[model samples]
Target chain A: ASKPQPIAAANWKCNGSESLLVPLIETLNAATFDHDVQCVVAPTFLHIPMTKARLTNPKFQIAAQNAITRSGAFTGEVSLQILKDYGISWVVLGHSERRLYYGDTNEIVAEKVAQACAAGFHVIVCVGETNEEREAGRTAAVVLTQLAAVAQKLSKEAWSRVVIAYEPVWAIGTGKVATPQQAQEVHELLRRWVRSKLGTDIAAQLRILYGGSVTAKNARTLYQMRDINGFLVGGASLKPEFVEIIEATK
Target chain B: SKPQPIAAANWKCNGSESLLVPLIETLNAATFDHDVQCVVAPTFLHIPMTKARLTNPKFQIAAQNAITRSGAFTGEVSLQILKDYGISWVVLGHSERRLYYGDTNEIVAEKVAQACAAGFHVIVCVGETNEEREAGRTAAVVLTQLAAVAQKLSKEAWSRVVIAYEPVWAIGTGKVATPQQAQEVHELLRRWVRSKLGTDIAAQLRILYGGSVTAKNARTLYQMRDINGFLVGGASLKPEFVEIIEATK
Candidate 1:
């Protein structure tokens, strides 16, 4: 109750067709939460309308995993203006999957975050390191570097529209996760860095989430971390456990 | 009536809700030969709306990109998703994807093979940079680009693929390739395909031209011996696009 309400963000990625969308959306529409908490579900680009119109929960927000920074002349890109038209308020940018596989560089991802914030949208800006960087003990440096690039573009108050997600590339999609203590360590490092970079008030108000195999079974313990403000769920987001994870946050 | 040419307007990361209605209005009102093979690719967010808005029975819709894999990739669109939406055409490996998004030859090849097998018509782009053109490596550059896909694609896959030659240097730059220059490359690709496959396959091929193609130059480019169609860009949003579509008639 004291801290910002915990977040359970689902990134369906490029997964789902008509069959999965029909029932999963019904399940999400019918979902209930006990205490004050926030939940955001990001579906593939084509499914945005089907999910947004069907999902009726007041506290739940629909998100897009990717968006074009601006409008026009780029084929196949859905822009933020269009997202606004669809009633989308939240967007997830620079996921490890996008960075690793889709050639999202730090520079381009930073531009995307700046663009979203400028357009008045909530952004879950993903920043994390790979197994090699962690093993080399540059996790802090690498993630911090990523944050600093976008950090320069926004003022302290603009950060209210931003949430930082430490979805370690190594742990992602590998059916693995950081222990509560391990998660707390990186999250605190991120929080302290923000505190120094932008003042204590904005840092305290900012929500930093952890991802990579976050499940209902482990949500409470991870949510309990002082700096771990939320969870960005991947695979388990599709299952009943997602609602369980929401309640666990409460 | 003559064989219909494909006139595709690639909004290229740009289109508006307001423009769709009037554009489609102008399109449906006009007359054309056979069924108009006019195709328009809007942004993914607007595809459903655009599809429902289109009144011309012969008009087709295409997606700008698709991923090689079906799922587990965040922030990417899949061909299956496109197919499910009744979208039969997909454009892959445009220069912007190569230069900005970093879609390498291998990645683009995988996408082509996937889209071909997914039962979608493919508009696969091949072109050369200004530096390559200056060095007289245009032939080698375009072929090297397709060789990646050739290795992965089956002989039958060619039936689903339509090649567009959009010279990277010709777009947005002051430079524009002449009709002869564009036709030279189109015929070169046809000849190259004949070598890889056979005479009959190349005979049936349709090569399109893209690169700042406006209403003024479209007729000339389309009349070139081997230039079968136009993949238009910026001019697609205006009355010029309707003119280009009319030319195909």
Candidate 2:
């Protein structure tokens, strides 16, 4: 809990060209985050290298929004080994859209997570319940089911290399913000799950981030939670206001 | 022997940008005999970036697919424009198009005729499936596909055409035809070419074999008299793809 204690990463998703990205990286670089907290941004595959080249600050690392498990033949696939070869330290896996568009199942996500880890990637694994599951009161059960699959595959020592992003599918792009209490409940639930599955030492040290439509308006309130160690930002991550959110944790 | 004709692998919508450059670099590092040409098929958006590395002619570039006309499908890139960008080659009528994208022989004929008209070289891929070859319709299937283009353009168009006889079953399947098996189909394609496009054109045409083409099997296949070169896939991602080209030497 001592190392200036907060981190914020942005998923620019399928946005930003090199033209816009250069200035954005420059602005973020000049600003100060007095906290030892780090800022990482995942741009689309087209921009990873360009962004990586533009980012001169060591505090700012880059992550690929996604990567495939296989090396060749899966057309349009960005492979994990290739991402690793490019020195991309982190990759976001199991986001909802990939599951919705590309038929990503828990097993496939687990496979991708394993491959990425094997290729020396730090995984920012996302998990959550859909609206239907939450309405049916199966939010925790559904998410835990997916979590167990990932937990079963990784050794306890590998826990440090992984981070968790809990994005409620219903809130993603839906203009609905979870109450601070609601998120704290989920954060504590996941912490307990981690403690049960992984050792208490690993669970205590793990950084669990809240993602989905986080804005400057709501960032400070959310960051104030005990278990909400940091945030995985979406749309607001692109705006200059992200600076305010970055400073909020301070 | 005339230098082995060069071939490029167009992995359209296959590898993302992160993998595209490294894959090409790997293929460039792999040793290929100086006798053949080696190139890659990148997605439309990658054309400018891939073509930017044109200092070496031995490393060529191709488009996975393109539109016959210039402008306005929102998603389609035109052959005329691509040619202007110095993208000299294109892969038309890939089986993936015929099977998955609803590309009929007639549509491919238009693309072939248009690409040639636009002054871009064309690799008109023709093939029969496992069933068609097994059912003994290989010549009929392959010729009909090419004949559709011949109907649209004259023998002059054949000058820029390199016929790639990719068995639908063999493409991406890693199951290459026996040398005799490939030569049988290739030789037949030559005769088919002669009758339709005339002896002078047929003699100059390069008929390549594509199917699970790799460095290990490339030498055996490229040594065949009519097997001028290979249109590679998986192995093409490695520098060793250049080595496959060296087999022709």
Candidate 3:
């Protein structure tokens, strides 16, 4: 509450080690941030504790990246309570990759979001269209469809705790970053959707982020967008550039 | 010296954390001589709890796999970020990935160099099979494989490299290689090193024989002059891993 409320999250989907991770944290710690913007790096569950221990600063924290919806017998899944116990405060839910690869559903993501918040963790809720959907001009349709599943579960008041990462499925990890204008358009629509659905005050205060193929070069442009409060970087966050995105926002 | 030559037991999608503790505790209790190192690559969900339990110098942790890059490659682990957490070592180009997943030696060699250049000590594995050996192409096959790696790596990089010659047929077959067989292949590997990587590297290099190597046969395999050590597979999962270390010492 004392900070600018800018947020940057790195979805380090399953990459870590003490040797590789230590240098990453050292770089983040060395960065100069104008605002005490909260930063999260969701490493594979194995390396989370090691990364967490290295963080002496309260501003920097870890995310579970992905957690299982239910505990015990789910098999190869992590849960909200388990993540909270590991000191993970944030999680990425409804990533297109997870939806595509793991068959995650809107209902499932809603459950995860509700559970994570119930366990007292913030959520970076992601929703976007695929390249084909964009070509079909179905961006709004896709976003609404995904959000509808989640909105049914959370009240308007809960929107403040959630950061929406508008990641287009096409641009993620494909090295094709969304142009600032292209990103802003979607963000504007998202903000509109927020105001319409959650009411003016909660949507106005909620921070919306642009995630997907974000880098040092593009971080500034994306951050400059009026509605683009922050980023949810993927690969760039592993390097010192994750710090660059933080600096861009601050 | 040199981070005590980190040796990691890669669980490879086996065992839940609850089932994993007893085995890890057994290995932790049975101490080993020499600078014999130990690390474990557990499942992703187990990493936090595993680190809490392994409060020792010898035991460390690694990821079974990491992402090539970050952001949106879901279900994949990234190496760049792995460093932030302090779990450094990563096994690139294991035979399982190569044989099953169509990971060409070429791409794996590149990944090997990538992990090394990015500052992760690579457990670079290489070997042919009984078919190649019987066909008298084992030396050529293995050397050609190393040549691909040699082309990508600097001579000094060998200091950060550990090569394991895991014969495809011998792996998990419970048929251990005879000392002579291992020696002949290791010597051939050394000669390949001498031919391609220079004699100094060949001499200084550690060549580990992996494939059905257990505590029972570890001693004989370790005695070979050319054989620097053994990369124990199944036994690495048990306290006998310590026995294999004692055998080497």
Candidate 4:
């Protein structure tokens, strides 16, 4: 099987201002990356146009953190069509923050993924388990249940547009890092699940990323995992060290 | 004492670059009555560009909604971010938000307090749906919604907020409240505000009416004593919005 292309995507998650964009973009534009690696940044909705305007490299792209599932009188919603209108092709859907705080259930996330993909946008679909589930030894059960819903809704062709991220609820923003062995265990299970559901060729080619507490220091170890093709970085995505994480993937 | 009136547009979940140019061009060319303040709200994507183009001091740009505070709340527009972009006003608690999304009175109050604290002039929306109005609970429900924000804000903070009464049954339904019906609620709201915050504050507050507000009916509605101005929906996107603005004169 050919090597999977690495996607190092950043979820800014409600952070950024006009003042921060220029310098961040300057650093990102100047940095060199491996030819196989693709970099995308998902800023808050307000900054997508700004980021899109400044990030001039072909290898680097911009995305929305989330978009309203569809158009209508959904006030305060950023529509997926609007994002496409703004020239953004990628979106981070179903982040745990949205799931926990905004009532985004698996059903809702599946709807968003199906809608976004149908609207010609690539989706980074997130699926993970909570601390309670992980502690109760139900981590694989929780992750599979989440992905199963999304897999059911998406057609075989739709799988080509998806990049999955496994973020443990406990590890996110908690300063707790998952060991490489622990991360690979889940990553392998996810790949096996996809293999059984889809096919060997599709599973082998899919890019599944690890998110939550992925720092520059530990990035190399996580990236080296057999099934961990890339990362959906959180806090480190905001700093200069994000450059190093990209380098680690190389 | 008479109130300082304003006309605001809510371009709910709509607008593209091409559609906004002509709408903004017509507005910029029209001469507004100095007695009336004119504001236009586009979708979030259009705010920066609209703010740049509509350079007239009389014209103000407003955000459709804002979140409590900055940091980690996905898909939320922060009040600080709006203030940073030189956007001084925001429209909160609209019926579309209440009916479609899950914005309750408590949540709306929290946003009002946050925006007011951030020094933004907020337009707080309060209204009852068809069911609530038919149940004869319009006055009670609207008062409870307003009381939520009133409780969160000090009298001074209340000075920064405008109350827009948009009945859920009337909004976007092409069924506008008659001047008498609008005046009834506006007058009742004013008296309630007077009882809660004092006559000085209530009399000074600008209470606008929204829901199928358009060119032909705006003049009659504007003529009413309690109906200070308007929170326009569809007409604001059309050239007729200028006619409604002219009615305020």
Candidate 5:
């Protein structure tokens, strides 16, 4: 019966324009699905101001897809200090695209997450296995190793500001999703690891979100699981069903 | 004024509301109207707000870097998004990006080709490091960088590209390249391009200098026959940028 507070976030994943975002923003503005459920839209660096200006829903917040640990002479990068300048409080670090397409290693992702939490931004740290990693039976090893680095870097107080998003790289944009049982299994692993690593109090308080191929078609049943608090949705976030996915909580 | 020059201020990964407000205020009030193409390239966070205030057609904003195309690449600013924001120029292949980030020659070539084809003005940076140059490979290294670009960009696209020759050994190190030394590289680039791309293309290209450019040295440096403009760094953040812009021959 116990579950962490649900958060429904749309990781636009390096995509968005005025036309594309406006429609989605309009739907979000008109509907207040659930006050208890937090919602966030993480867009491209260039699209942040426009998205924030158009967004009217108090429950809906904005997030940067990524931020550098610190800012100075790193051309073409944004930092947590700058995100705060834009009045943005939340940030997503360590997306699969950043890990795979770009060269962000586990250590790099951990370092960035620690920086975001240290700088007082609400951090969403994504952790998951590739299809390759999953097939080799290394899911727990990979997930634990990724979280362990951040756990080592962050102070105890920083745990409250961090949200863990378990996004399987294989399921993202592949239109293939982890079934309900599969999602809860990994989320259970996350909760157990937190208790084992950080202690029972922190584990009980942590909010773990399932990601990758989560849509309105499957959100409610997934939310029903004891460990799957909510989702970090991909393609569905851009559609009308993002509202439906958020509505799944009730 | 037959050949118009371009002086761009690249504020790499720096700035805030307090810094931007007064800095752009002076730029809006300044008097250099179209004598030189004045461009300010800010961090992506600063571009939208900066573009809104700097209204003169003579004044413009450029994205410091961009991905070749838009879709599913997290955290990358795309050319389509730049065009949507009405940002007219993009600086590609800056040494900092190449040296630290994974902007390899092939990746930079794709960026230059796509941004040019997307009809945006591109400030393309090229140069050699202390190790590369100390080995007496300056010409070979710089040309090899451009050679990757030449394959992706059309000869016509060369018209949209402005070259900023900032030797890596000098960038942000306070070791400014002497006017004669910078002119030597500029002259070589023009001569080299003319041989391959033809006289008409090379003649119209704007080859600018970058690296520790200050208002004190701008006049002497701009006077060099081949050093057409500048891609300024830290000095670009201050009102002194206008002085650098006005140093047109």
Candidate 6:
């Protein structure tokens, strides 16, 4: 099994405005982190260009929070090609809000992953179970089922371009986070599940991230877990603590 | 109706930061009359730049589509945000959105209500597909689409919208609705509004024709008593857009 590097990704979600771009970039540019660790920001679509222009660090890649399934005739949707044109290299697909509100089924997420991979972008594929599903003890099966679709669609080689973010629907924006043990339980099961399907090398190489109410307070405990490579942070990403989370892994 | 002509460019899923400046520059420099309104709907990426530049009140920026509320709809721009950005207009229910994304009449109506509530004017698009037209249900289909929105909006809310009848059969297909065909629908739409609302409001509503409207054909279509203006396609990105504005003038 290959070792995984740390990644602290900011999923700004529906937050931020034109006024926030410069200061956010200033904060990012001034902060330092481990050369081995990767830092990325998924700003809303409107701020991508502004963030790309201001954050000059080559190590810090920018991600779009979401993109359209295909390019043409999808009004109000940003395409992967357009993201590439704007110098964006990463995309966060299938966030819970999109799944719950915008009707992005697992099939749609798989299609987006395939398309983003084909278009040469790093894809962050989020898979999670709802509170009821978790309470029903179906977390592993539910998350696995979500990844199963993506697994069937992606070739073994394309797996390298993907990162799995395990966010519990119950925890997202709820001020509730999975305990380190709970997060590790899912991350390990995910790794083992993928290992059985794609061989140990691909599974080990895949960076599994923990998301949902991830803040500086709890990041270190979660980072200590063997399979918890890093985080797909939400509210904390918009604050100064995001840098602390990035440095926690170092 | 005094027939205030409008020429709106739906850049559709196209345009970049590079194309925006020159297009806005050319548009601002071009001369048109007080009787004409010129609007361009760039990709959301360019909306900020379009709003910042193109300062002439004669030229306005329009969002191609907007979500109903402000928070938690990922990848969607809300009308509240658009208003905050100083964008005053939106293009709702374009055939492409309706066909591809399942933007139902109810959804479009909700958006129209939100946009109007936020004090942004709406260019509500209504159209019939080629098959529907071929089936001899063009008027029925178009009115049905329009009726969905009409049912939701009040007589006062209807005042904030401009109806763009872009027949799906013609948009981007290079085939256009003949002047007679276009006038029939516009006249019908006006009468429908007059029936739903009262005479004064119906007469004041503007109905624009869209679908492969070019500079060459702009005047002929604008000459129709019911065809108030255009929601142009390919020609909107080109310099000929100036000529279309001139035709509207």
Cα lDDT of model 4 by residue, B89-176, tens digit = 9999998888866788999999999999989898999888777888899999999999998898887997788989887867555555
Kindly report the fnat of each predicted structure, to 2 decimals: 0.74, 0.06, 0.31, 0.51, 0.77, 0.40
lDDT of 2 by residue, A74-144 (tens): 43345676666667888888887666643467988888788778778888888888887888999899889
Q: Estimate, for each residue in A61-130, the C-alpha lDDT of model 6 and write its tens digit.
A: 9998888755555666678877777667799998888888777899988899999998899899999999
DockQ of 1: 0.67
Task: Give the lowest summed-lDDT range of ten residues in model 5 chain A.
Answer: A169-178
Report lDDT per candidate: 0.82, 0.74, 0.71, 0.84, 0.86, 0.82
lDDT of 4 at B41: 81
User: Which residue segments of model 1 deviate by more than 4 Å?
Assistant: A173-177, B1-4
lDDT measured at residue B182 in model 5 versus the true structure, 0 to 100: 90
Per-residue lDDT of model 2, residues B157-191, tens digit only: 77788888877866555565677788888899999
Error of 5 at A93 (Å): 0.2
B7-57, model 6: which lDDT tens digit per residue?
898887766667667888888788765578778888777666677788666
DockQ of 3: 0.15
On DockQ, the stronger of 5 and 6 is: 5
DockQ for every model, please: 0.67, 0.12, 0.15, 0.63, 0.78, 0.50
What TM-score, over all chains together, does every model reach?
0.95, 0.67, 0.57, 0.95, 0.97, 0.90
The per-residue C-alpha lDDT of model 1 at residue B8 equals: 88
Q: Per-residue alpha-carbon lDDT of model 5 for B1-249, expressed as tens digits?
A: 226898899989888878887999989888874578888988888887897788666877899999977787877888988888788799999998898778899999999999999999999899999878779998998888888888887787887889999879775555657899998999998898899899888888899898678989999988888888999988999989888888874
* TM-score between candidate 5 and the true structure: 0.97
Better of 1 and 6 by TM-score: 1
User: What does candidate 4's lDDT look like per residue over A117-207, in tens digits?
Assistant: 9989888988888887888999999999989988999998888988899987866656666788888999899999999999998898899
Candidate with more favorable, higher DockQ: 2 or 5: 5
Interface root-mean-square deviation of model 5 in angstroms is 1.1
Candidate 6 has which clashing residue pairs, if any?
A: none
Error of 2 at B200 (Å): 19
- Across A64-101, the per-residue lDDT of candidate 5 in tens digits comes to 99999876888888888888877988999888888887
For model 4, the superposed segments whose C-alpha errors exceed 4 Å read A173-176, B171-176
Q: Report the CAPRI category for model 5.
A: medium
